[PDB]
Amino acid sequence: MKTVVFAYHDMGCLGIEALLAAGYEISAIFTHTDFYGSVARLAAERGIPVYAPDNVNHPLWVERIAQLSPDVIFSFYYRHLIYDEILQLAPAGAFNLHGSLLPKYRGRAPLNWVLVNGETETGVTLHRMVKRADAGAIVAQLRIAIAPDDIAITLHHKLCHAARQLLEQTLPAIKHGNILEIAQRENEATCFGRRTPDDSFLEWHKPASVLHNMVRAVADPWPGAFSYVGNQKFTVWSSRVHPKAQPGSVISVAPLLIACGDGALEIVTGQAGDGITMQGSQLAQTLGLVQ
Amino acid sequence: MKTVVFAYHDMGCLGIEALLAAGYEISAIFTHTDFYGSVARLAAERGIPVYAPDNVNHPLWVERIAQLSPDVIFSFYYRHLIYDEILQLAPAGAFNLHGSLLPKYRGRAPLNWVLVNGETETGVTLHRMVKRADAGAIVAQLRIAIAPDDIAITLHHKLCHAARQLLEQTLPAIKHGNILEIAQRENEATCFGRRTPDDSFLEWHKPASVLHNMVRAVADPWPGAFSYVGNQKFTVWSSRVHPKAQPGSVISVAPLLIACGDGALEIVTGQAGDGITMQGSQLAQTLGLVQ
Amino acid sequence: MRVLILGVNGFIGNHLTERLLREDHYEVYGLDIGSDAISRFLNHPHFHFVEGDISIHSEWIEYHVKKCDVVLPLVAIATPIEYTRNPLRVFELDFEENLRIIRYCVKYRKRIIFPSTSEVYGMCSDKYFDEDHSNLIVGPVNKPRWIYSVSKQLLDRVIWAYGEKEGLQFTLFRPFNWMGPRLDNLNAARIGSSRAITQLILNLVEGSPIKLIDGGKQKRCFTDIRDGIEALYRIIENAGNRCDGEIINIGNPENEASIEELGEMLLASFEKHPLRHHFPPFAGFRVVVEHRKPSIRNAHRCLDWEPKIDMQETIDETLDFFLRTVDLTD
Amino acid sequence: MRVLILGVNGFIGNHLTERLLREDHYEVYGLDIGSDAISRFLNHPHFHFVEGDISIHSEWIEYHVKKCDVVLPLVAIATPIEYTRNPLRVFELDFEENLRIIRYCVKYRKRIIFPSTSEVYGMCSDKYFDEDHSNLIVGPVNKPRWIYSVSKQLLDRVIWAYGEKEGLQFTLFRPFNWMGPRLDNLNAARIGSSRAITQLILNLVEGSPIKLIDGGKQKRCFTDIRDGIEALYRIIENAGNRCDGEIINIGNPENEASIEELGEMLLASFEKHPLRHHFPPFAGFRVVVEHRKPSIRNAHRCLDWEPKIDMQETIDETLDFFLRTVDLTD
Amino acid sequence: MRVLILGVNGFIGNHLTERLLREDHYEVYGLDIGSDAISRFLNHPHFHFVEGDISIHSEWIEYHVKKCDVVLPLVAIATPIEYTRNPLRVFELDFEENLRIIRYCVKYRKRIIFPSTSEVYGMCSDKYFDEDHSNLIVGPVNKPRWIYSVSKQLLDRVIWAYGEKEGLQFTLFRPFNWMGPRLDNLNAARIGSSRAITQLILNLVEGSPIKLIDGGKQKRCFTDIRDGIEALYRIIENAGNRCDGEIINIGNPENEASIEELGEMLLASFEKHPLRHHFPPFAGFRVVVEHRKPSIRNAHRCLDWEPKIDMQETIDETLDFFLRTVDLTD
Amino acid sequence: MRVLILGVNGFIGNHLTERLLREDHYEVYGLDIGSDAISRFLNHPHFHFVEGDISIHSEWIEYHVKKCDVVLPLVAIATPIEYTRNPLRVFELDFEENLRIIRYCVKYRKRIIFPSTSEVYGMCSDKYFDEDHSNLIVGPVNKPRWIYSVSKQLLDRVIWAYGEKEGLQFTLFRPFNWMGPRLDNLNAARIGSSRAITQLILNLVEGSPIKLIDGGKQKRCFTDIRDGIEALYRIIENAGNRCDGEIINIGNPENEASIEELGEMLLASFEKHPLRHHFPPFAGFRVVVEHRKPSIRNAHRCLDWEPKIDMQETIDETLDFFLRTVDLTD
């Protein structure tokens, strides 16, 4: 029943709320050293001890896990690595949730490349850990959809709701015991990482839909899709695609329209430098754009 | 009936939404320079230009207000003084929403001033401005109670719903025309000084209830109630009062209670320095306190 | 807290210090070459004098800035003739050294109260003198004798820059012709001695006829020393944490008074002085910037302050006191 | 003798060097961090380049000051973004080092030829711009870019002081809106060209519609490098000693033109020039300080100088140059 | 002869001065920022206080080094607050200028007696405790507040180097938790304050129940001040020149006593104090570097010195003193 | 971008430069007192040498730091006997000059990759070697070998401190026993030459008998420069921003070889050496720390790097290289 969970961020918070809804007790909450309701406040309301060490790779934390003897180990969107030297101490294993569809479509930075194509079918996988990192067998996988009008905040809300109703089904599966896994292809395994900020620069040679996903990926409060003309910075927050002259000139100012590799792009909102966000026509007025 | 509003923060956005429900058109919004909902997003989706000048006490901005010709001014929790430079443009005048029992304890930071006495009867007051700020007739007064278990964020939320449901029938009142308001009782006005840092320092001679209401009022996301012993800092995010003891002596350990001017206090949520939140056992483990 | 005021030996410095001596949590370290004007309050236990000169001692002043908590410069040269004989001396003293001090204070994150001068506005035609929005008119190009003065305004601009990138807690303040006891002499390098009042003293003691400059109708304004220092007291305690990075002025525009009416009321107050018998009579009248308005919006936005004492009483008791304390060594 | 021109890598520096190499009793040692623009003259026997930077190098500049016989300060930072992000940088470089070289020049009795700025007039309301007799109007204090600019003016005032008591051999000269071949690079933050003509070259190269500011009625004066530089030469030998304490402007007031005729001349040369086929066309005109006429009395008074080269033909050579010298491998 | 002690304001500094005043051919000039701890000694003619700070004055302390014959460094921060707030500042300051003192002293060939810190051992678990052949143990590198302590050990090494290259006579001397009358407060930046004993004094004055931390079986030892100070007298007189290059330790192995017995004699001395009526009563017991053995072989081989005074009565008298002299300043 | 290499003339410096010329966005202006080993790459268009020595030049180094975009120190004393011949010089060179360059880079916010030494662990008794949690060991004072090593470790500590209080972007990286072409000479003050492999160079080329030192069981790990410099590329480009404030180790743990197998496969690769008949045969065998494993978890976590080249290949082709480059003159 009682186990020591390692969690972090709102994914971890929601996991704690999920297992609490089923009556699960947490011996200790090993999180990293840190507006939403803090899990620390909730755990203090329940009166249960908390520890947040910088690292568990000492004999001392080894003996904590030894005599606490947890019964099942989870991983909600953890940032710091848990390498096999700690995975050995787990009696029943470790189950990590990750937001991509295994085993297909792996590579570099899956999150943005599922946004590039705007796929209506994505998924989130709860999977095991083995001697080979992130190569354990699939335990469960769930499917989700992407709407054409989704902004970052609302689709994050969707993924939280998805985690909710998914864990609602995974909790009975684990309490009943071990669940049969589904094998993967070893010839299609990798190790994922992150991206660079320099991807925010708007290469206007890219297609209109591609630029749409680029604008989508940097929605508020991400740094934003920034570009410079002369010595002037700006960032675009939202835009649409609409169906002459040589590509590269600005067709109209009110509304401001930009020619691209295919079709035209109409900018809804942008911020110029450090100034507040405003619609395209005033931006073109200050920037001196021409029709 | 086009007007220029000056709004800021979530009561400002709420006033914008209420005015939009009335059908009033905003020529431009003179908002002050900036987790709350930024007005820029809604102004972009609904298509209203928004201007944020560093100052409006110039010939050119007042020429702009003259050409737009607003018919009304609204004030949502404004900070600065309104000198006649703004009072002259209004044909119908200006009207301010304030969260206090005027004319008591007027001025900057009235939030602590109204929670000093912890009334079970406080609300929101609309009023008109004259050459002397906060001296015009009261338009409406709305009341709500505070429960002993109310936390600062829930009070703010309740003030927000109260503002919505109040504006809901105050906007028709000004729509139908002028109403004979109620004048201020000048026989209830006083003036005081400033606030000292000692209000942050948890001193132990005032009785438990008053500092309890302050502590529950300065909860997160406010800095919190922090105090030092020796060279070690802590903050009390929340507490309860438990019922003839020497002040300064440690009463108990598990649970732990603190002697105060009247009654006894108990820490349930709090954190030392920059650490995680935890009930007082671990804090007294680091400090070393025993009964 | 600890206060270090550069140039303790002076009118404004002495007054502000003696005002501070009523609050018990102040330790005062006052550095200057001279201590004659502070010859009474030196024995006060928490005030200690320091023989110094910012031109030479460098580590010494900076050590003071480190041990203290707030630093207030108050030194400036207001001698017109020195503007012509050796403008270079004043140029590298009143500009360079204090600029180094501002750099030091920024480097080690110290709060600064800087005294600016009211002469930067000039002759703006608007009914309200604005500092960042009004226009400027200047004098002839061919005269460089006052170039030093406008240089001081440039120094203010430097402090302005310190706002936008470092967030320094600077408080720029400008006297508008304060008055009070323990005024300064002709050759004393202390500001505050309005040419009107000083000219009145000299025309009485020398007994020369009153020059009605264009009929003596040119207007002037005056301010009380107490109001200024209590204002500075509230910024030093910084009531409400709203005074940081704010520009505050202290003045009494309702005191619009021409030289003639000053003459009549000051005489109407002075002919009642009993000991006049060792003072020559008056010799008759001979006939012979112009309109300045301060802004007091920021004052009510931060401190809510307002002046009390009625002026002619101040001027006549000060005149009586400087009349009864005539130096016998002359 | 020995000539040091500090800031050799630039438009005016390069043309000054080209003019100086036309006479036989000069040695040219140029000090700067870069040498790309003057790499044509390295092979010339009397040219000698030295890497330097006034911000960091101190001994090198002083050693050259000792060894040389004429010293020409010429470089200035004109980066717009640096004005906004870090005014402290431009203040800490552009002011104090230059004052240091002026003071060394005083200590070593050296000629100083300082390039004062022509933008001091601003918005003078008089129909005839004057320098020392007309009034001056400046913009608001809230804009940050003047923060540096105004100090430059104060800087000039300092050398003016050196005129009176010690009589330093100084000359403030003001170029007005110059042009000539070997144009500056697009992204180079170097002065030497008008913004109107530069934006016009951009409007041609990018083919953007020319924005007619109020019909393009704003009148400007343009000068040629050759005439002004020969005038500079005859100030360098300082014939008659009469240029001491003299402030010299350079300009062609007669050659005053609005934007409109510049556009007409641009179209006239553009529709005729043959190599156009690698460039985009013009997209038409879109409809959307105003008059500057400086005095040139002192130039006749001291040197008797009258300009020769006109305005249109120089545009033709400059535009033909910047059209033909675009690298085909782009 | 002539003695300079840098860091005159101290506990051990006060006792050292007090004992030097017994000898008749010693001139003491003590420089430090404050003189409160030595306020009794100000009036004594042969001691002269100097307001100063080693962080700032450089040539001036060197002038002291010139005028004297022996130099005694005594400064170090033992206050935990600088470790937690900004350990880098104390690391850069209280470390580097010490090497400045050593370099100046070796240049001038001056006699140096430096107090090494007892923190270089750490937690050595080796059975054979040694000071020059055993190893030292430090904790995790993740924490910065020990960075400074270990560097102190390095400083000792530097002094050692100065031996073989110029032959400077150096004495690394190490007091260990000396206590006696005239203790120091918690926040005093003076070495010699064993946090254990001070915490015991706090437990007594507060009158809180005696907290038996793990039964109080931890063992401690204590030393007398005057026996060590007379040892330092014999080093100063340099009997036989046998102290050069030898590390001297002063400690009492025999007074090896647990916290429990210490507390028993502590109450046995406290319960006879008459002034208990201003004091809370005995609240009762409530249950909740293991050993340092000093090798005194070097002390015998250099001085033939032994300790004489016992601890118990001195601790009782110091307790009674600090109970009688409770700060009357309510 | 621009890269500055302090001490580019060396094994590591030459290899880093040679591989950095494979990329097209690098400008290398390398400063050191010598350039003989980089005679081949000095002519490369973007590689320019600067004769310098940080012990004398002060503004020069800060100039290069400002003008560049990344600064990489590469100098270190790999000479053990120099630790004893004049220890003061190595203390004055290795410690505070480098502290100065770190402070200078702090003032300028430059990305610093600091080459920490492998001696940070020293002789830690714990079997499970850690980097930030295990203990550290220092040697006896009478043995001078540690006076350098331990102090070096302390400097590393200092850099880390500049992280949390100054916001410095630091990259501590430690080279472990690299090898490759262009082997270092006997007296080269550049790291990158293992005592073991160099000793074998003496044994073979000098023709000394093979010492069977206690059987040759102690084991060492070796690295190739290519893997490391590829790592330095992925840190310079900073893939994923995950190396900020992290400590990274570069080594090859799995391929760990004792001396006996090293000598055996050396003799194997020697028996095939083509130029053997110009070098005298072996003179016969003569009959005569223990564990070091690296923890490279952080390197995998932040970079995902793996090693490629396996030792015997580098060993035999490098031995063949330095055997065939024997001076053919004699």
Numbering used by the authors:
A (entry chain F), B (entry chain E): 1 to 34, 41 to 249, 253 to 300
C (entry chain I), D (entry chain L), E (entry chain H), F (entry chain J): 316 to 603, 616 to 657
Task: Quote the study that presented this structure, word for word.
To gain structural insights into a putative complex formed by FtsH and YidC, we performed single-particle cryogenic electron microscopy on detergent-solubilized membrane samples, from which FtsH and YidC were purified using Ni–NTA affinity and size-exclusion chromatography. Although SDS–PAGE analysis indicated high purity of these proteins, cryo-EM data sets unexpectedly yielded high-resolution structures of ArnA and AcrB at 4.0 and 2.9 Å resolution, respectively. ArnA is a bifunctional enzyme involved in lipid A modification and polymyxin resistance, while AcrB is a multidrug efflux transporter of the AcrAB–TolC system. ArnA and AcrB, known Ni–NTA purification contaminants, were also consistently detected by mass spectrometry in Strep-Tactin affinity-purified samples, validating their presence independently of affinity-tag selection.
ArnA is a bifunctional enzyme that catalyzes the biosynthesis of 4-amino-4-deoxy-l-arabinose (l-Ara4N), a nucleotide-activated sugar that is incorporated into lipid A to reduce its net negative charge and thereby enhance resistance to cationic antimicrobial peptides such as polymyxins. In terms of domain organization, ArnA is a bifunctional cytoplasmic enzyme composed of two catalytic domains: an N-terminal transformylase domain, which catalyzes the formylation of UDP-4-amino-4-deoxy-l-arabinose (UDP-Ara4N), and a C-terminal dehydrogenase domain, which catalyzes the nicotinamide adenine dinucleotide, oxidized form (NAD+)-dependent decarboxylation of UDP-glucuronic acid. These domains are connected by a flexible linker and act sequentially in the Ara4N biosynthesis pathway. For ArnA, 123 593 particles were processed through heterogeneous and non-uniform refinement, initially using C1 symmetry and later D3 symmetry. The final atomic model comprised 12 chains and 3726 residues, reflecting the hexameric organization of ArnA. Additional variations were observed in other surface-exposed loops, suggesting local flexibility or alternative domain orientations that may be influenced by differences in sample conditions or oligomeric assembly. A previous study has shown that ArnA can adopt multiple oligomeric forms, including hexamers and tetramers, and undergoes conformational changes upon substrate binding. Although ArnA was not detectable by Coomassie-stained SDS–PAGE, single-particle cryo-EM analysis yielded a 4.0 Å resolution reconstruction, which currently constitutes the highest resolution cryo-EM structure of this protein available in both the EMDB and PDB.
